[PDB]
Amino acid sequence: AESSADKFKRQHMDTEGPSKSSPTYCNQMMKRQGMTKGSCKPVNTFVHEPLEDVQAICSQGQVTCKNGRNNCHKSSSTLRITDCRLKGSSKYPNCDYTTTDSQKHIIIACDGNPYVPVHFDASV
């Protein structure tokens, strides 16, 4: 399989995407990024911020994780995010998402050495 940090880059990063996402961003990006394969991913988030800024979160205050682990960290600032969540209608392979724009703190899970981001935990 691919790096757990590369996968994250595939699934959750979009540095120069518009802060003004058109209502067709999700349907377009979820498919291009591979989250449409064997099934439609239910909920996903993209971070329109530089990787340098995201990697730095691994140095901020540590919070516990949803799976009970020690490696999660809560951002000390609000990042530009975009939520994509499936619609009631949707019938695979025709995955249909709703594009929601926002700006909340993100809780990521880091690991390894170099200690790099590996999973997206939550939005607060």
Curated annotation (Swiss-Prot):
<dbReference type="GO" id="GO:0004522">
    <property type="term" value="F:ribonuclease A activity"/>
</dbReference>
<feature type="disulfide bond">
    <location>
        <begin position="58"/>
        <end position="110"/>
    </location>
</feature>
<keyword id="KW-0456">Lyase</keyword>
<feature type="disulfide bond">
    <location>
        <begin position="40"/>
        <end position="95"/>
    </location>
</feature>
<feature type="binding site">
    <location>
        <position position="7"/>
    </location>
    <ligand>
        <name>substrate</name>
    </ligand>
</feature>
<dbReference type="GO" id="GO:0005576">
    <property type="term" value="C:extracellular region"/>
</dbReference>
<dbReference type="GO" id="GO:0005829">
    <property type="term" value="C:cytosol"/>
</dbReference>
<dbReference type="GO" id="GO:0016829">
    <property type="term" value="F:lyase activity"/>
</dbReference>
<feature type="binding site">
    <location>
        <position position="66"/>
    </location>
    <ligand>
        <name>substrate</name>
    </ligand>
</feature>
<feature type="active site" description="Proton donor">
    <location>
        <position position="119"/>
    </location>
</feature>
<comment type="function">
    <text>Endonuclease that catalyzes the cleavage of RNA on the 3' side of pyrimidine nucleotides. Acts on single-stranded and double-stranded RNA.</text>
</comment>
<keyword id="KW-0540">Nuclease</keyword>
<feature type="binding site">
    <location>
        <begin position="41"/>
        <end position="45"/>
    </location>
    <ligand>
        <name>substrate</name>
    </ligand>
</feature>
<keyword id="KW-0378">Hydrolase</keyword>
<feature type="disulfide bond">
    <location>
        <begin position="65"/>
        <end position="72"/>
    </location>
</feature>
<dbReference type="GO" id="GO:0004540">
    <property type="term" value="F:RNA nuclease activity"/>
</dbReference>
<keyword id="KW-0732">Signal</keyword>
<feature type="region of interest" description="Disordered">
    <location>
        <begin position="1"/>
        <end position="24"/>
    </location>
</feature>
<comment type="similarity">
    <text>Belongs to the pancreatic ribonuclease family.</text>
</comment>
<feature type="binding site">
    <location>
        <position position="10"/>
    </location>
    <ligand>
        <name>substrate</name>
    </ligand>
</feature>
<comment type="subunit">
    <text>Monomer.</text>
</comment>
<feature type="binding site">
    <location>
        <position position="85"/>
    </location>
    <ligand>
        <name>substrate</name>
    </ligand>
</feature>
<keyword id="KW-1015">Disulfide bond</keyword>
<feature type="compositionally biased region" description="Basic and acidic residues">
    <location>
        <begin position="1"/>
        <end position="17"/>
    </location>
</feature>
<dbReference type="GO" id="GO:0050830">
    <property type="term" value="P:defense response to Gram-positive bacterium"/>
</dbReference>
<keyword id="KW-0255">Endonuclease</keyword>
<dbReference type="GO" id="GO:0043202">
    <property type="term" value="C:lysosomal lumen"/>
</dbReference>
<dbReference type="GO" id="GO:0003676">
    <property type="term" value="F:nucleic acid binding"/>
</dbReference>
<feature type="disulfide bond">
    <location>
        <begin position="26"/>
        <end position="84"/>
    </location>
</feature>
<keyword id="KW-0964">Secreted</keyword>
<dbReference type="GO" id="GO:0009617">
    <property type="term" value="P:response to bacterium"/>
</dbReference>
<feature type="active site" description="Proton acceptor">
    <location>
        <position position="12"/>
    </location>
</feature>
<protein>
    <recommendedName>
        <fullName>Ribonuclease pancreatic beta-type</fullName>
        <ecNumber>4.6.1.18</ecNumber>
    </recommendedName>
</protein>
